[PDB]
Design a protein around this ligand. Sequence first.
Ligand SMILES: Nc1ncnc2c1ncn2[C@@H]1O[C@H](COP(=O)(O)OP(=O)(O)O)[C@@H](O)[C@H]1O
Ligand SMILES: Nc1ncnc2c1ncn2[C@@H]1O[C@H](COP(=O)(O)OP(=O)(O)O)[C@@H](O)[C@H]1O
Ligand code: SF4
Ligand code: SF4
Ligand SMILES: [Mg+2]
Length: 593
Amino acid sequence: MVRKMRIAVIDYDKCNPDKCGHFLCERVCPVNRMGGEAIIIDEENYKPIIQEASCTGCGICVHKCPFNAISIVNLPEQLDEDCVHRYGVNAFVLYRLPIVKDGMVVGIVGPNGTGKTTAVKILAGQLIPNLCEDNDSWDNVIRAFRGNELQNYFERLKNGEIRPVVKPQYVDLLPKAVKGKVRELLKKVDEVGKFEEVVKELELENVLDRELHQLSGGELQRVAIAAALLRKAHFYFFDEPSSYLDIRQRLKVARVIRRLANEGKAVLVVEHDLAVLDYLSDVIHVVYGEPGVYGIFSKPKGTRNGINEFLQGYLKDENVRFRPYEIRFTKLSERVDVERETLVEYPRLVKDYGSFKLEVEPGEIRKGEVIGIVGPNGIGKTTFVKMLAGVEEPTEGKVEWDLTVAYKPQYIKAEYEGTVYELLSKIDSSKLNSNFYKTELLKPLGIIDLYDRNVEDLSGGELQRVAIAATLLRDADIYLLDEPSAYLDVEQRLAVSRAIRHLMEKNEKTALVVEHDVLMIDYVSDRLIVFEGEPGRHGRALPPMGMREGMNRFLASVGITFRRDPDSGRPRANKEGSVKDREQKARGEYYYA
Ligand SMILES: Nc1ncnc2c1ncn2[C@@H]1O[C@H](COP(=O)(O)OP(=O)(O)O)[C@@H](O)[C@H]1O
Ligand SMILES: Nc1ncnc2c1ncn2[C@@H]1O[C@H](COP(=O)(O)OP(=O)(O)O)[C@@H](O)[C@H]1O
Ligand code: SF4
Ligand code: SF4
Ligand SMILES: [Mg+2]
């Protein structure tokens, strides 16, 4: 059997006809070479256009583009009949839609730029799908979904019977849309009368009297989650609630949100934190395809199965492989019995800012291991790191080591006039040419597609990746990475976990990683360091302990339990009040393996 459509997307924001000669496309294009119209010139808006009706998909134009403003993919005809929406000529297109279920939480996972948020505005009524045509009505939509269980949802959606509530992705815009303090907005938006329950569970008591613009990311995020739970509806759609929330906060909100399913409401959530997704979700959808080009929603899957196939990069039913390599967690019985040596040691430390005090318990750092640091923000994790980096003088104690350090800072504000390739090549040009470094670092994080860009012109997520890659291309005795997962989609977090683990493993080096993402911590860690106390007041970093003893100490502070997926080896979360959640807690066993 066979069947195949060609799909061309050109990121115009990257095209510049005057720099590549005269539309390098039509020139290099074989079809145009033999009097054909694969690539046509829009001599007005001055852009090139690929008439997919021609394009053999040979991909010559793609390789040639001096930047990379062209993508040509060969897909099977069949999806053409499940096309849901396309943003225009050579623009991004989405296939299929996720299913919403009364009384449950349907999770959604996949890399950004594959229509996760596109699916949300559509099911919420904000965007009427154009069926990859010129459609502008709901009736044509209802017809297209005849036979699907969504056909009815949409009939109702058009009638005005149901109207979903939405926690928007971009919370950093809320301030510049509303005015006043937090108490006011939450009063108005309230419709179920629970100003107290909500504001309390989300620990908003303080912020209440402050103003929108005086809020941080975490706070802003939380105020959004809040206004959403205060709404009296039936459909709730949360887009990326994990953002800006620390290890503790993000896990506590899933529990708050998931309870909506209990009240018999239909919940939908997009997530990049697998542990948060697992705990939340009853059903799950994977979205695969190339970012910015096209996206396809898989059939609904059981949280467990769905999440494992995800790690493998192969969706059995759909029968697709969206990632060359898999990502498997090492069982436990697979681990290696090793007596490591001490690399360096640190005495009791104390940093006192006057308004906030941190105390560090004495500890040993071993050569070749990886210690993950976890704890709520405002507790002293970064302060700690800066003392080992030496960029911070202790109030008491003293870290005088004779070692080289590679430090990937938490808040990086790119200020370097140059390109990514310039910056990296100046660190270690040879490694950039290494088949090992290109395979484990450079390609996985996508620093090749970034070489040409200027460091100052990079986005939060890109800058994160380049910093991480910069840090890891250096030769040091110890590596310090302060919160790598920030601004990274699900796929990027995984690539970085595998990278950090592989590179440290290969060159036999030691590293310390602060993280709020449970799966990354579990993946890269050999040991753990937990912080407790009163955020913003005092914090105490415990001594390095085993993973089990560690996760046990931290998790009890949140009230969540984890098992071990027999197959994947990944940490599997227990839903609030499950038989296992009960047994495990009764024995104070929050983490297995
Ligand atoms: N209004 C728009 N016009 C054109 N392209 C858009 C628009 N909104 C989103 N896109 C493109 O669609 C792709 C997927 O969009 P989005 O739903 O935001 O993705 P995800 O939620 O997976 O990050 C991105 O490449 C994005 O640039
Ligand atoms: N120079 C300073 N003066 C006063 N307070 C500070 C200073 N630097 C940090 N803090 C406060 O210390 C607390 C913890 O800081 P930090 O170690 O950065 O936390 P985290 O665990 O989020 O990394 C925060 O409440 C922060 O406002
Ligand atoms: S797509 Fe690439 S090669 Fe073609 S005009 Fe644009 S910049 Fe030039
Ligand atoms: S992929 Fe090949 S055939 Fe299609 S537009 Fe580019 S060069 Fe022409
Ligand atoms: Mg045209």
